[PDB]
Amino acid sequence: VFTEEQEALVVKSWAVMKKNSAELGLKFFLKIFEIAPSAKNLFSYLKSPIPLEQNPKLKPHAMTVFVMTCESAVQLRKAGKVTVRESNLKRLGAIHFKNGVVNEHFEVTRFALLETIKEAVPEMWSPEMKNAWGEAYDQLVAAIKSEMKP
Amino acid sequence: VFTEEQEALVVKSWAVMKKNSAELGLKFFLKIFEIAPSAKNLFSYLKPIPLEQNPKLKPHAMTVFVMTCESAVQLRKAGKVTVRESNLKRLGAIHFKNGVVNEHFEVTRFALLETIKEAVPEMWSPEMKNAWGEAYDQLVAAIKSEMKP
Numbered sequence: 001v002f003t004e005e006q007e008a009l010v011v012k013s014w015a016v017m018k019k020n021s022a023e024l025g026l027k028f029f030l031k032i033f034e035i036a037p038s039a040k041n042l043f044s045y046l047k048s049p050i051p052l053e054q055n056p057k058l059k060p061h062a063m064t065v066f067v068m069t070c071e072s073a074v075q076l077r078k079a080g081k082v083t084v085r086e087s088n089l090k091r092l093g094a095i096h097f098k099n100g101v102v103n104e105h106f107e108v109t110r111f112a113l114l115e116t117i118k119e120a121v122p123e124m125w126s127p128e129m130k131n132a133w134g135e136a137y138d139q140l141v142a143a144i145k146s147e148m149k150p
Numbered sequence: 151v152f153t154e155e156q157e158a159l160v161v162k163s164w165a166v167m168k169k170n171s172a173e174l175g176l177k178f179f180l181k182i183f184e185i186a187p188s189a190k191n192l193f194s195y196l197k198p199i200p201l202e203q204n205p206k207l208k209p210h211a212m213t214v215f216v217m218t219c220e221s222a223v224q225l226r227k228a229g230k231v232t233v234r235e236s237n238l239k240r241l242g243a244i245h246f247k248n249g250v251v252n253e254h255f256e257v258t259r260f261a262l263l264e265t266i267k268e269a270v271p272e273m274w275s276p277e278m279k280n281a282w283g284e285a286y287d288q289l290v291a292a293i294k295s296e297m298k299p
C-alpha cells in the first residue's frame with residue numbers, strides 16, 4: 001500500500017527536479033544506455049545523426065516516465081491503484097510489447113531512474129525516497145504490462 | 151592493443167579484491183539483480199531462498215572476476231583471449247542455451263565495474279574502469295563468438 005509520506009516524497013522531489021528537465025532527460029537516457037547500450041536497438045528511430053543520444057524523441061520519453069511515475073504516486077495514494085485511461089494503457093502496452101521491451105528493460109530503467117534522481121537531488125536522497133519512487137514506478141509498469149499482448 | 155598499465159591495473163586490483171572475494175562476489179551478483187532482478191530467471195538454480203543467503207551465487211560471481219583478470223593477462227601476453235576451444239565452445243553453448251542476451255552482458259559489466267569502484271575506491275580512476283571494461287569486453291566477445299546451437 002502506497003502511503004501519504006511516499007506520495008509527498010515523490011510529489012515534492014519531482015516539483016524540484018522538473019525545473020531542470022532538459023538535462024534530467026539526457027542524464028536519464030545516458031544512464032539507461034550506460035547500463036545497457038543495446039537497449040538503443042529497441043528504438044527504431046535510433047537507426048540517426050551522431051551523437052545518436054541527441055535524438056529529439058528521447059527527451060519526451062524520459063519526461064513521460066518521470067511525469068507518469070509521479071502521477072502514479074498520486075493515484076496510488078488517492079485511489080489505491082494506478083488509474084491511467086484504458087485507451088492510453090492499451091496503446092502503451094501494445095507499443096512496448098511489439099518493440100520487444102522486456103522485464104530487464106523496465107528494470108534497467110528503474111535503476112537508471114533512481115540513480116538519476118539521486119544525482120539530481122542528493123540533498124533530498126534517502127532510502128524512503130528511493131522506495132517511494134521505486135514503488136510508484138513498479139505499479140505504473142505493472143499496469144503497462146497488463147496490456148502488453150498481441 | 152592491451153597495455154602494460156591496463157594489465158597491472160586489473161592484476162593489482164584483483165589481488166587486493168581477492169582477499170575479500172566471497173563478500174565481493176556476493177556484492178557483485180546482488181548488484182546485477184538490483185539492476186535487473188529478472189536476470190535471476192536465467193539460472194536454473196535461482197529461477198528459492200533469499201538471494202542474499204544463497205551460497206549458489208558464489209561460483210558464477212567468482213568466475214566472472216577470475217576469468218576477466220585472466221583475460222587481461224592473456225591480452226597483454228598473447229594479443230588475444232586464450233581460452234581452449236572446448237571450454238569456449240561450452241561457454242558459448244551454455245549462454246546461448248540459457249538465453250543470455252547483450253543486455254545481460256551489459257548489466258553484468260556495469261555491476262562489475264560498480265562493485266570494483268566501491269571495493270577499491272583508492273584504486274578507482276577512468277583508466278581502472280577502462281582496463282577492466284576492455285578485458286571483460288574481449289572475453290565476452292570470445293564467448294559470443296561461440297553462442298550458437
Ligand code: HEM
Pocket residue numbers: 039042043044045061064065068092095096099101105106107109137140141144
Ligand atoms: C514507466 C515506464 C514507461 C513509460 C511510462 C513509457 C512511455 C512511453 C510512451 C508515451 C511512448 C510513445 C511515445 C510516442 O509514440 O512517440 C513510448 C514508446 C516507446 N518506449 Fe516507452 N515507456 C516506458 C518504459 C519503457 C522502457 C523500459 C523501454 C526500454 C528501455 C521503452 C522503450 C520504448 C520504445 C522502443 C517505444 C517505441 C518508440 C517508437 O518506435 O516510436 N519504454 N513509451
Ligand code: HEM
Pocket residue numbers: 189192193194210213214217218240241244245248250254255256258286289290
Ligand atoms: C565474461 C562474462 C561471463 C563469464 C566469464 C561467465 C562464465 C560462466 C561459466 C564458467 C559458467 C559455467 C559453465 C559450465 O557449467 O561449464 C557459466 C554458466 C552460466 N552463465 Fe555465465 N559467464 C559470463 C556472463 C554471463 C552473463 C552476463 C549471464 C546473464 C546474466 C550469465 C548467465 C549464466 C547462466 C544462466 C549459466 C548456467 C548456470 C550455471 O552453470 O551456473 N553469464 N557462466
